[PDB]
Amino acid sequence: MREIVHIQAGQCGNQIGAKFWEVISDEHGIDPSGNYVGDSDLQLERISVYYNEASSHKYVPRAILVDLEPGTMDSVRSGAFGHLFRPDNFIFGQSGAGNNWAKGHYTEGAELVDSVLDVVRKECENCDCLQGFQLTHSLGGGTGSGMGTLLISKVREEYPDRIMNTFSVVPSPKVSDTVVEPYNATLSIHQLVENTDETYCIDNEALYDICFRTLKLATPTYGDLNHLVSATMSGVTTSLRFPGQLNADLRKLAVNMVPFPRLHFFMPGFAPLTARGSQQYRALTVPELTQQMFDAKNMMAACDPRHGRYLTVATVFRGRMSMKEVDEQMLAIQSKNSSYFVEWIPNNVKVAVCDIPPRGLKMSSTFIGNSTAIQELFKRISEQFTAMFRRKAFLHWYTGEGMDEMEFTEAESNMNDLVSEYQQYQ
Amino acid sequence: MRECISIHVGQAGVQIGNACWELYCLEHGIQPDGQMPDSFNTFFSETGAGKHVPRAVFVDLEPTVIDEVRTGTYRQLFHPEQLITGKEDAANNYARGHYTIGKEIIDLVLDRIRKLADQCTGLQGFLVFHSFGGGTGSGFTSLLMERLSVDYGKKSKLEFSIYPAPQVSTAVVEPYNSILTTHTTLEHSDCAFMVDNEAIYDICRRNLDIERPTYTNLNRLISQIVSSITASLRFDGALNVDLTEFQTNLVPYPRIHFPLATYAPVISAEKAYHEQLSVAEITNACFEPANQMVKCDPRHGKYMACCLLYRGDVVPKDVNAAIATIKTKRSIQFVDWCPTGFKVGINYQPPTVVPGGDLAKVQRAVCMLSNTTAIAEAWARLDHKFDLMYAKRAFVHWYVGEGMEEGEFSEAREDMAALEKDYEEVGV
Ligand SMILES: Nc1nc2c(ncn2[C@@H]2O[C@H](COP(=O)(O)CP(=O)(O)OP(=O)(O)O)[C@@H](O)[C@H]2O)c(=O)[nH]1
Ligand SMILES: Nc1nc2c(ncn2[C@@H]2O[C@H](COP(=O)(O)OP(=O)(O)OP(=O)(O)O)[C@@H](O)[C@H]2O)c(=O)[nH]1
Ligand SMILES: [Mg+2]
Ligand SMILES: [Mg+2]
């Protein structure tokens, strides 16, 4: 009930996906074989949200692991909790399409788009009821940005009545493992402003910065970064996936967080983040989680909440607490940080709670926030784009494959029109 | 032979249904099975030899809520079908609940209450429990209340709205949906009770001394005021009060029917032994500017009428003496046209306490449902929230995309607007 598909793209999504189910399988006591071993029944009641119930009381996810090269999925099959996936949902290609958006969007994506539109069209109508669509990609690559953007663009014109979402790892200047990621991200955002009604602009820059000061780990691998994002979006969906004292599903938070269609680019968060040593000293309580998740350093994105004011936020808890200590504080947050919150919209918060905790912890939250701080993000990409676009550099990889030059100036106009709206309300 | 029944909308109403029916089953001695090892005739339906079942419907689009009941301890108590359950929630939207998703589910709930209505000899009215959050409690009740206005226009239509507080709002679009929901309740419902989440917090924080109150402790208090209103029917009393005369005393005008509520004795177990509860004390406790469960200033707003429903070991003289003390107090005033603002109700049933309940066992208790102009202040705060964001045209395209028109929002404000003037005019 209120089911939803799960899509990947590139190294990012497929690696995020591998740990997306490392935790959810633990939230339901699922083995890597797909077998149910968990003891609780609250977790099994809504197994149907993510899992097509297979024979021998087994469970396997929707999990459309799509990619333009087999290097990822050949790894995911060997990875832990990799056998539970369906092999039919391993939609591979010949060449990974490189970091070229157009060569991953127009032709080489079209070569494979029909193979992945049929399997989602299979899973979609197979579901009793679908809440929406959900994927995990990056705006910097060509795979996650070329076909991962084409894909959702074709799913909305096939299923426009259904809301959806996307967890897009945006590029960054410091952690920049790509040259043309302005072009890849400037062109994907051209579609995501209309082809998706909520985008969680995670950025790999912060996820290191969080793990140095807060976790204080000496070897943050990509997995350790993903363990934040995997346990993050699990919080976004825990409302509908488990019972709750107060529930906020993907639609109930999207509708009341997005005032205008263009303004739906978010930043997530996750309150309890501690070293293995400094956890015992910190008594985790709702007033302390709350101040920990509204600050600048906990939220995972390449922007500063201090500069830009909040429009809307939400706090999806995963603990058995009292709603008094929750909302008395989140009014106190808006009293202390009244300048940082917008005055037009009173009580920008949309709180939500779940009765069950995650494994190991007693309490947890997630901070989704639509701010004007991400103005600086898109304002920065337009600077990287404009400097690289003034001199028509790297275009012949785009222009030769397709991608007429007029479309580049259209993309920056929208993003310049996008930030133009954030400053309009700021 | 009175047959008062109770429909429930939203997790606000459903989780109150868990409290209200946990309470009633403790009153009559009904086990959680539904089989008791007359009073129950009002709320329950006898079946077989000893099996009793509640006359209610827990309609809720979000299946995650009702599954707590269908996976709970009252599984074998509630009739399986009257736990109506949709498939996709209204998601804090009048539009998604009022028209779009409502059409898919009215056929199940209407035909079930109709199976309860005709089964009842003669019913007084149905108790609604809908919050103004925006989901089922705002739109799905709007269509439900009007379809019952045409089906049952004569019968009383009560409700208990968890009105969003002005200082605190659990969601973002509560300033919208509460203003949209005002139309159906002022035109259909005969008297619409109001409750705040921030108000109940202050009671249980200050008096009961609980700094971590949960919704299983809030609703456990609204379960009592509802039981207080219905104990006149559900049990005998030396001076009973029926719903048709209850609302007759609060409602001098047809539109002025939005009272607040109050429940004086709210004290811990150890707190009980130290302080003896007298009829003149619980009476005076109700008239405090904070003991009521609506965030307002009763000192500024003149009272229009009241129905004090004492219950338990109570006598009438000290009620008649207590109310004499109230009229002498200068902080408590009444409008000129109303010489008498006190209706009274007594019954020999004390309030029943849930085991492991924050509430204490008291030999007597009182609930009063005051209709006054103090509620205009709470509404003036949220009407300022509405026109503020609505001036910016915020979140309207989520409604317009669902089917409603932009003109409807101004009309709903106009209905609330003229409603504010009514409390001001009668105050003169
Ligand atoms: N925070 C994380 N960031 C990641 C992870 N994996 C990749 N990335 C980042 O995401 C960006 C996306 O790169 P891709 O996944 O598209 C590599 P791929 O060859 O599949 O893309 P194409 O260039 O389209 O072929 C890249 O700049 C990385 O810095 C991860 O596990 N965590
Ligand atoms: N007193 C009290 N109020 C509640 C409770 N749960 C929710 N509310 C109030 O109800 C409002 C939200 O409406 P809900 O009843 O959750 O509506 P819903 O069932 O979520 O409807 P959908 O959004 O369509 O799922 C909030 O403003 C809360 O203040 C509760 O347990 N007790
Ligand atoms: Mg790639
Ligand atoms: Mg709900």
Sequence-distant (≥ 6) Cβ neighbours of residue A303 within 8 angstroms: A267, A371, A373, A374, A375, A376, A377
Q: Which two tokens stand for residue B307?
A: 């129905």
Residue A128 burial by Cβ neighbours in a 10 Å radius (0-12, 13-18, 19+)? exposed
Rounded Cα distance, B330 and B308, in Å: 20
Helices and strands of chain B, counted as H and E runs: 15, 11
The residue whose two tokens read 């004795």 is: B265
Report the amino acid identity of residue B274: H
* Residues A2 and A249: beta-carbon distance below 8 Å: yes
Burial B214-242 (b: 16+ CB within 10 A, else e): bbebbbbbbbbbbbbbbbbbbbebeeebe
The CA distance from B340 to B358, in Å, is 36
Contact B197/A at CB under 8 A: yes
Residues with Cβ within 8 Å of residue B167, at least 6 apart in sequence? A331, B198, B295
- Per-residue H/E/C for B3-21: CCEEEEEHHHHHHHHHHHH
Q: What's B98's DSSP letter?
A: I
Question: In this structure, are residues B158 and B127 in contact, taking their beta carbons and an 8 Å threshold?
Answer: yes
Q: What is the resolution of this structure in A?
A: 3.5
What chain A holds in terms of domains, given with CATH numbers, is: 1-259 (3.40.50.1440), 260-373 (3.30.1330.20), 374-426 (1.10.287.600)
Q: Which fold, B375-428? A: Helix Hairpins (1.10.287)
* Burial class of A172 by CB neighbour count within 10 A (0 to 12, 13 to 18, 19+): buried
Residue with tokens 């008395």: A328
Residue B302 vs residues A48, B288, B338: alpha-carbon distances, Å: 55, 14, 11
DSSP annotation string for A54-84: ETTTEEEE--BEE-SSTHHHHHHHHSTT-TT
Q: Which residues contact B60 (CB under 8 A, 6 or more apart)?
A: B8, B9, B10, B11, B13, B14, B66, B84, B85, B86, B136
What is the bridge-based pairing of β-strands A265-266 and A199-200? parallel
Radius of gyration of chain A (CA): 21
Between CA B43 and CA B28 the distance in angstroms is: 11
Pair A266, A232: CB distance under 8 Å: no
**Please, what sign has the CA dihedral across residues B407, B412, B418, B420?**
negative
Q: Closest Cα partner for A163 from A264, A19, A13?
A: A264
- Measured CA to CA, the distance from residue B368 to residue A386 in angstroms comes to 69
CA distance A177 to chain B (A): 38
The set of residues, in sequence order, having a beta carbon less than 8 Å from that of A208 and lying 6+ positions away, is A175, A220, A225
SS3 of B267-317: the string is CCHHHHHHCCCCHHHHHHHHCCCCCCCCCCCCCCCCEEEEEEEEEECCCCH
Closest CA to A279 of A204, A355, A363, A382: A363
- Six-digit token string for A383: 């600077």
Q: After which residues is chain A broken (C to N over 2.5 A)?
A: none
Helix (H, G, I), strand (E, B) or coil at B92: coil
Establish if A348 touches chain B: CB-CB under 8 angstroms: yes
What lies within 8 Å, CB to CB, of A74 at 6+ separation is none
Task: Tell me the three state secondary structure of residue A248.
Answer: coil
Fold that domain B260-374 belongs to in CATH: 60s Ribosomal Protein L30; Chain: A; (3.30.1330)
Distance, CA of A381 to CA of A415 (rounded, Å): 9
Please give the interface size between A and B, counted as residue pairs whose CB atoms are below 8 Å apart. Answer: 114
Token representation of residue A90? 């391993």
CB atoms within 10 A of CB B211: 12
Residue B95 Cβ inside 6 Å of ligand 2? The answer reads: no
- B88/B38 Cα distance (integer angstroms): 40
**Would strands B44-47 and B51-54 be described as parallel, antiparallel, or unpaired?**
antiparallel
A121 Cβ contact partners less than 8 Å away, ≥ 6 residues apart:
A158
Reading the block at residue A206, the tokens are: 């912060």
Of B427, B193, B154, B161, the closest CA to residue B309 belongs to B193
Q: Which two tokens stand for residue B265?
A: 């004795």
Could you tell me if the CB of B216 is within 6 A of ligand 2? no
Beta strands in A210-275 (DSSP E): 265-266
Instruction: Give CA–CA dist B416/A142, Å, rounded.
Output: 54
Best probe of the B interface among A159, A263, A331, A345, by most B CBs < 10 A, is A345
Q: How many CB atoms lie within 10 A of CB A74?
A: 13
Residues 61-80 of B with CB under 8 A from A: 62-65, 67-68, 71
Q: Which of A268, A231, A329 is nearest to A16 (CA)?
A: A231
d(CA A193, CA A211) in angstroms, rounded, equals 30
Residue with CA at minimum distance from ligand 1 atom 18: A10
CB-count burial class (<10 Å; 0-12, 13-18, 19+) for A133: buried
Cβ A3 vs Cβ A50: under 8 Å: yes
CB A350 within 8 A of CB B172: yes
* Beta carbons within 8 Å of A354's beta carbon, 6+ residues apart: A238, A239, A242, A243, A244, A245, A247, A316, A317, A318, A319
Number of H helices, E strands in chain A: 15, 14
Residue nearest to atom 17 of ligand 1 (CA): A11
CA A260/CA A263 separation, integer angstroms: 5
CATH numeric code, B1-259 = 3.40.50.1440
Instruction: Name B330's Cβ contacts closer than 8 Å, sequence gap at least 6.
Output: none
Using CB atoms, which residue from A240, A251, A347 is nearest to B169?
A347
Question: By the 8 A CB rule, do A202 and A300 touch?
Answer: yes
**Token pair for residue B351?**
């309030």
Report yes or no: A144 and A66 within 8 Å, Cβ to Cβ.
no
Q: Which segments of A64-134 does DSSP mark as H helices, in order?
A: 71-78, 101-105, 107-126
Domain pair B1-259 / B375-428, same fold: no
User: What is the torsional sign of CA B32, B33, B39, B44?
Assistant: positive
Write the burial class of residue B108 (CB in 10 Å: 0-12 exposed, 13-18 middle, 19+ buried): middle
Domain ranges within chain B, ordered by starting residue: 1-259, 260-374, 375-428
| Cα gap A101→A107, rounded to integer Å | 10
| Distance (Å, whole) CA B121 – CA B166 | 43
Tell me A21's DSSP state.
H
Closest CA to A18 of A223, A300, A238: A223
Q: Which two tokens stand for residue B22?
A: 């946990």
A288: exposed, middle or buried (C-beta count within 10 Å: 0-12, 13-18, 19+)?
middle
Breaks (C-N over 2.5 A) in chain B follow: 37
C-alpha B214/C-alpha B290 separation (Å) is: 19
- Per DSSP, B39 falls in state G
Chain B partners within 8 Å of A353 (Cβ): none
What determination technique applies here?
Answer: cryo-EM
Return the structure tokens found at A76. Answer: 């995911």
CB B112 within 8 A of CB B162: no
| CA quadruple A23, A24, A28, A34: dihedral sign | negative
CA atoms of A297 and A37, how far apart (whole Å): 38
Residue found by looking up tokens 């990409």 in the block? A381
- Between CA A85 and CA A247 the distance in angstroms is 29
* DSSP string across A267-331: ----S----SSTTTTS---HHHHHHHHSSTTTS-SSS-TTTSPEEEEEEE--S---HHHHHHHHH
Q: What is the C-alpha separation between A242 and B164, in angstroms, rounded?
A: 25
Q: Which of B89, B389, B395 sits opposite A252 (nearest CB)?
A: B89
Q: What are phi and psi of B194, to 5 degrees?
A: -125, 145
Residue in B378, B370, B369 with CA at minimum distance from that of residue B168: B378
* Ligand 1 atom showing the smallest separation from residue A104 Cα: 24
List b or e across B60-96, with b for residues whose CB sees 16 or more CB atoms inside 10 angstroms: bbbbbbbbbbeeeebeebbbeebbbbbbbbbbbbbbb
DSSP for A146-195, written as a single string? IIHHHHHHHHHHHSTTS--EEEEEE--SSS---SSHHHHHHHHHHHHTTS
Least Cα separation, residue A45 to chain B (angstroms) = 8
Beta strand B303-312 with B371-372 is antiparallel
* 8 A C-beta contact, residue B88 and residue B132: no
Task: Give me B127's structure tokens.
Answer: 């108790």
A331 interfaces chain B, CB cutoff of 8 Å: yes
Query: Crossing angle of helices B317-328/B279-286, nearest 10°?
Result: 40
**CA pair distance A233, A256, nearest whole angstrom:** 18
Determine the Cα–Cα distance for residues B296 and B290; give it in Å rounded to an integer. Answer: 8
- The answer to whether the Cβ–Cβ distance between A243 and B67 falls below 8 Å is yes
Residue with tokens 């009961």: B208
Q: How many CB atoms lie within 10 A of CB A277?
A: 8
3-state helix, strand, coil in chain A (%, to 5): 45, 15, 40
Give the CA radius of gyration of chain B.
21
Could you tell me if B132 and B11 are in contact, meaning their C-beta atoms sit under 8 angstroms apart? no
- Active site positions of B, annotated: 245
Q: Looking at residue B402, what DSSP letter applies?
A: T
B320 Cα to chain A: minimum distance (Å): 38
Q: What is the distance between the alpha carbons of residues B338 and B252, in angstroms, rounded to a whole number?
A: 10
Lookup result for tokens 């201090």 = A306
Q: Cβ(A236)–Cβ(A316) under 8 Å?
A: yes
For residues B330 and B49, what is the distance between their CA atoms, to the nearest angstrom?
Answer: 57
User: Could you give phi then psi for residue B75, rounded to 5 degrees?
Assistant: -60, -55
Structure tokens of B376?
């205009």
The bridge status of strand B51-54 relative to strand B191-196 is unpaired
Q: Which residues pair with B162 in a beta bridge?
A: B195
Query: What is the layout of strands, in order, in the sheet containing A310-316?
Result: A349-352, A310-316, A367-371
Residues, chain B? 428
Spatial separation of the C-alpha atoms in residues B333 and B326, rounded to whole Å: 9
- B197 labelled as ligand-binding? yes
User: Secondary structure of A203-215 in the HEC alphabet?
Assistant: EHHHHHHHHHHHH
The whole-angstrom separation of Cα B291 and Cα B300 is 16
Instruction: Report residue B46: phi and psi, to 5°.
Output: -70, 145
Using the Cβ of B136 and the Cβ atoms of chain A, whether some distance falls under 8 Å is answered with: no
Helix (H, G, I), strand (E, B) or coil at A426: coil
Instruction: Spell out the SS3 assignment of B113-181.
Output: HHHHHHHCCCCCEEEECCCCCCCHHHHHHHHHHHHHHHHCCCCEEEEEEEECCCCCCCCCCHHHHHHHH
